[PDB]
Design a protein around this ligand. Sequence first.
Ligand SMILES: O=C(Cn1cccc(O)c1=O)NCCc1ccc(-c2ccccc2)cc1
Ligand SMILES: [Ca+2]
Ligand SMILES: [Ca+2]
Ligand SMILES: [Ca+2]
Ligand SMILES: [Zn+2]
Ligand SMILES: [Zn+2]
Length: 159
Amino acid sequence: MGPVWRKHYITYRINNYTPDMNREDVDYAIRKAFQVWSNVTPLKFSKINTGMADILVVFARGAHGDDHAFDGKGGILAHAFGPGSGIGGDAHFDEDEFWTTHSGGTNLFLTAVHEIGHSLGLGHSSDPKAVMFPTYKYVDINTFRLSADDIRGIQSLYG
Ligand SMILES: O=C(Cn1cccc(O)c1=O)NCCc1ccc(-c2ccccc2)cc1
Ligand SMILES: [Ca+2]
Ligand SMILES: [Ca+2]
Ligand SMILES: [Ca+2]
Ligand SMILES: [Zn+2]
Ligand SMILES: [Zn+2]
């Protein structure tokens, strides 16, 4: 297996907010994205407002300090680093995307579920119904669920 967090209690911080959305809508999307993974693992996620966090959430564009420049509007929407110290675990969202609460532009929640998947140590799935499938499709956020493969995946890492 790839790297995993060596503890079940994991902290996150939002470094900065996309101007695409209300601040409160960003907090909710991220919180709900961690809750999706919390619901099928022993993992507990704690939001910190100041100081050291395992998972730093970042909105940045272009070349943004890692070896993985974004590519402007479209193509790559986001990446994340698997478990580790420093940039390990951090989730980066391409600010050249139009982040939304809905089916318009790019839904932040759905993208964050995928990214936090990687932050917890998951690769991509070959199952097209998996959130860890490489490509973004909007699906109804009310009816949204992890696929059997996504649960199998994160449960093989934690519990
Ligand atoms: O950045 C991407 C997808 N993507 C799209 C167009 C062109 C690309 O080169 C490309 O990589 N993927 C990482 C983000 C991501 C992947 C899957 C999902 C997803 C959304 C809803 C249900 C299942 C998976 C969300 C976000
Ligand atoms: Ca992009
Ligand atoms: Ca980190
Ligand atoms: Ca934007
Ligand atoms: Zn990055
Ligand atoms: Zn991915």
